[PDB]
Structure 1
Amino acid sequence: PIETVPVKLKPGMDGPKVKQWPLTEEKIKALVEICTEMEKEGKISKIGPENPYNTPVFAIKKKDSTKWRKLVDFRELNKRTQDFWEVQLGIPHPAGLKKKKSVTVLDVGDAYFSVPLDEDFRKYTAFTIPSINNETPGIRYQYNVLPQGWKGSPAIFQSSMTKILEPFKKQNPDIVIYQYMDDLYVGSDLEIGQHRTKIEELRQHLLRWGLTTPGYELHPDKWTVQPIVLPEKDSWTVNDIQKLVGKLNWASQIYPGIKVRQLSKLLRGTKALTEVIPLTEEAELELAENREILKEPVHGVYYDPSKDLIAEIQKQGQGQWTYQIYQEPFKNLKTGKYARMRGAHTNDVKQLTEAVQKITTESIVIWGKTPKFKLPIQKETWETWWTEYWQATWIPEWEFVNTPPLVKLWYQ
């Protein structure tokens, strides 16, 4: 019997209507189940053809569960409420949570199961459950409470949340807490043993206000960056210096201090490619002073909260991936690398979904945004297999690029 905060769509934008893609029968019987008991509890109620709105839904298995999780694809419903959850009831960002020597993740989705939902807005959050070979027409539901995975649910509930957390924030004044969609990030400078206790503390302190937690430990200080590496060689061949001058000249777009003039004199004839050449001293100097300017971060590159985050991934072979997070071209806000993760040297898509997920956390922690993804894969390959290896509770917005390695710059 709680009063309902009203929700309305952004000016002049219709609700989401996204087609529901086919599903493996193993995620059908489970989503047929998760909705039987959510309807028996009243969390959702069946609808009919008068609703022209639909949002995708599928099933993930969180890491080592054997108990399925229901996950809905709210990206098109999300980007259509944006003035509600950005300009109005937003969530501020704890600039220092990234400094913490340790950070734990906890799934607070059960708490959205209670608080009721505005009656105008439950027509835009309807999802269909498919059946195999188009037998039963799709068993279309809709959401009577604050749904899981929406970006308006942590904006409405943040009040009832601050009160539930208010005893524990006064009890530990150093600890830093940030809340993103269905997830909660708790951060302290305590040591991993004393740290694992404090979460169990917040686990029951929230369990007594009705939150049931279905550990995930981050270490934002230990995080490394990816160096723009030039080769170090005893002997250079005509071929080696063209590859090098190509990297520096491809590099001159970020670090404006690089120079290629004196190493190009080194290539003054129309020579064979494997011929070894002596580096002049003006070129040993050009080579060194370049190896320096790369030791420094890019200049004047600072996060701009109005701009979207962009993340590009490059597949460097042998189970290693490179990536860059940016907002404007050649102004890199972060770089990284991933190696021999799960699915190492056995599966690439398993590897990328691991790559995409581990990148989304790094950005939510440092900027409170889900970076937009440029995926190096064809579209039907990602759709068909991603949710098998997807374990997160959010879903970032992505596009697929067909880019060859004109320069395989990032490692070599």
Structure 2
Amino acid sequence: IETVPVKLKPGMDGPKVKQWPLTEEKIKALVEICTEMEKEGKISKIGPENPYNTPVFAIKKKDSTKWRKLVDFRELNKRTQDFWEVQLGIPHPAGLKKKSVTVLDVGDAYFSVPLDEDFRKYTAFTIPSINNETPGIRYQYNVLPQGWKGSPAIFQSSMTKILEPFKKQNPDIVIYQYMDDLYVGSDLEIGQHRTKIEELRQHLLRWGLTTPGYELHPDKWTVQPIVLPEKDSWTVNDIQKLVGKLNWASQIYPGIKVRQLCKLLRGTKALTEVIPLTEEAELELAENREILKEPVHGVYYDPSKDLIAEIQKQGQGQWTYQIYQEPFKNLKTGKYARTNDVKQLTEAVQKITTESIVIWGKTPKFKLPIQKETWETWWTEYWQATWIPEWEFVNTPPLVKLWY
């Protein structure tokens, strides 16, 4: 077909990111995946006249054994935003976040559309070699690539033709496309939903597009409150911490009255000294916590601002997080629990990212509590998504205290 002319954000230039070192098997795995993408003519070898580079990795399928190529187009996406967002934007359904949602990988569907011959140089990538004993294999895309948010946008046309029949015959089933994935949601019963899915897989199949699984239940995604203890005992130590956390709960969740519980059994007593109880207190613990159960009044999602995900390590496979646009203005807090610390953190990121895509339709930027070099060395060892969120590394302060 005719290629959709693509252009970069004027003033900006193609990606020039280095290829992070890979382990033997991921190399061998890729030189095989790319050697076949060459037969099929989806990518072509390139010359030194290409000054560009975008990194790539090999991850494992849905826990199977067939490696997948994962190109990190995180940069080129930015250099292309104007294109994939305003020009050919893809609408997000507010209904999706409301009994079941299946995620289907309509990815292979892009390698069928040519890519503007004038844009292919911007998708160059390199397959490194151990110990640098060899130049290093270079390539570029001739067809729409998979990590590139640009792909969905161009393919957003053909896609509609495919789904159309299925949509016209199921006016109540929601379909959302998001960079490589198709999100199908319905209020039906598991059996009726699950069936309707297969039904869709067949429509897809007729356009040369096989499918998988993986079911999310959005209507049961709930907020993670900021808990307040409730022990029968009570030490000066305990009550102090209680007034410590309640303090925090004020720079957010406006209305948290801590006046009564404060100045409580004060003076200069030993931390141990067990203490009584008050009636203003009994009422303040409850009066406040009740405010802590509900969402922050005054906070609303802002389509123009970035979403941020902050994750704290709670200990014992416990991880707590928060999604917000303006510090301490939580659009949502949550949890994640149940081997390696890195193995769990990446797990949580994807869960969170997935939830973010369903609700706001965009991935958040993670402020990750780990050492940069460590993350980079292993994230791709447990990663299974086809997208890669933005991420900065932070040093979690003595705030793990409160669950937020």
- State the TM-score, normalizing by the size of structure 1: 0.95
Q: Is the 8 A contact 1:94 1:176 kept in 2?
A: yes
SS in 2 for 1:133: helix
Alpha-carbon distance between aligned partners in 2 of 1:385 and 1:272, rounded to the nearest angstrom: 47
SS in 2 for 1:83: helix
Aligned in 2, Cα 1:83/1:403: closer, same or farther, shift over 3 Å?
Answer: same
Question: Which residue of 2 is the match for residue 263 of structure 1?
Answer: 261
Worse-matched range after superposition: 295-304 or 275-284: 275-284
Question: Which residue of 1 is the match for residue 49 of structure 2?
Answer: 50
Worse-matched range after superposition: 99-108 or 156-165: 99-108
Describe the superposition over 1:180-206 as per-residue Cα deviations: whole angstroms up to 9, x where unpaired. Answer: 011101111121112221111111111
Question: Which residue of 2 is the match for residue 363 of structure 1?
Answer: 356
Describe the superposition over 1:313-367 as per-residue Cα deviations: whole angstroms up to 9, x where unpaired. Answer: 11111111111111111211011111xxxxx873111111110011111010011
Alpha-carbon distance between aligned partners in 2 of 1:308 and 1:213, rounded to the nearest angstrom: 32
Q: Is the 8 A contact 1:228 1:409 kept in 2?
A: yes
SS in 2 for 1:314: strand
Q: Is the 8 A contact 2:55 2:126 kept in 1?
A: yes
Alpha-carbon distance between aligned partners in 1 of 2:228 and 2:25, rounded to the nearest angstrom: 49
Q: Is the 8 A contact 2:7 2:119 kept in 1?
A: yes
SS in 2 for 1:254: coil
Q: CA deviation at 1:212?
A: 2.4
SS in 2 for 1:124: helix
Describe the superposition over 1:143-177 as per-residue Cα deviations: whole angstroms up to 9, x where unpaired. Answer: 11111110100011101110111111011111100
Q: CA deviation at 1:282?
A: 2.7
Question: Which residue of 2 is the match for residue 136 of structure 1?
Answer: 134
Describe the superposition over 1:50-108 as per-residue Cα deviations: whole angstroms up to 9, x where unpaired. Answer: 111000001000222211111000111111111111111000010001x4401101101
Q: Is the 8 A contact 1:102 1:189 kept in 2?
A: yes
Worse-matched range after superposition: 155-164 or 291-300: 291-300
Establish whether residue 189 from structure 1 lines up as the match of residue 187 from structure 2.
Answer: yes
Q: CA deviation at 1:284?
A: 2.7
Q: CA deviation at 1:267?
A: 4.3
Alpha-carbon distance between aligned partners in 2 of 1:158 and 1:270, rounded to the nearest angstrom: 68
Aligned in 2, Cα 1:214/1:235: closer, same or farther, shift over 3 Å?
Answer: closer
Aligned in 2, Cα 1:208/1:407: closer, same or farther, shift over 3 Å?
Answer: closer
Q: Is the 8 A contact 2:312 2:400 kept in 1?
A: no
Aligned in 2, Cα 1:32/1:92: closer, same or farther, shift over 3 Å?
Answer: same
Describe the superposition over 1:280-339 as per-residue Cα deviations: whole angstroms up to 9, x where unpaired. Answer: 33333322311221232110211111001101111111111111111111211011111x
Equivalent positions of 1:164-175 (< 5 A) are 164-175=162-173
Q: CA deviation at 1:394?
A: 0.5
When the two structures are aligned, how many residues end up with a matched partner? 404
Alpha-carbon distance between aligned partners in 1 of 2:400 and 2:377, rounded to the nearest angstrom: 30
Q: Is the 8 A contact 2:366 2:389 kept in 1?
A: yes
**Which of 288, 298, 303 in structure 2 is aligned with 1:290?**
288
Worse-matched range after superposition: 274-283 or 126-135: 274-283
Q: Is the 8 A contact 2:99 2:217 kept in 1?
A: yes
Runs of 4+ in 1 over 4 A off after TM superposition: none
Alpha-carbon distance between aligned partners in 2 of 1:48 and 1:12, rounded to the nearest angstrom: 25
**Which of 377, 383, 386 in structure 2 is aligned with 1:384?**
377
Identity %: 100
Describe the superposition over 1:194-237 as per-residue Cα deviations: whole angstroms up to 9, x where unpaired. Answer: 22211111111111012122511111112122011111122321
Aligned in 2, Cα 1:96/1:271: closer, same or farther, shift over 3 Å?
Answer: same
Alpha-carbon distance between aligned partners in 1 of 2:36 and 2:181, rounded to the nearest angstrom: 23
Worse-matched range after superposition: 207-216 or 153-162: 207-216
Alpha-carbon distance between aligned partners in 2 of 1:62 and 1:310, rounded to the nearest angstrom: 27
Equivalent positions of 1:11-410 (< 5 A) are 11-97=10-96, 99-338=97-336, 346-410=339-403
Worse-matched range after superposition: 306-315 or 59-68: 59-68
Q: Which 5+ residue runs of structure 2 have no aligned equivalent?
A: none
Q: Is the 8 A contact 1:247 1:407 kept in 2?
A: no
Alpha-carbon distance between aligned partners in 2 of 1:407 and 1:390, rounded to the nearest angstrom: 25
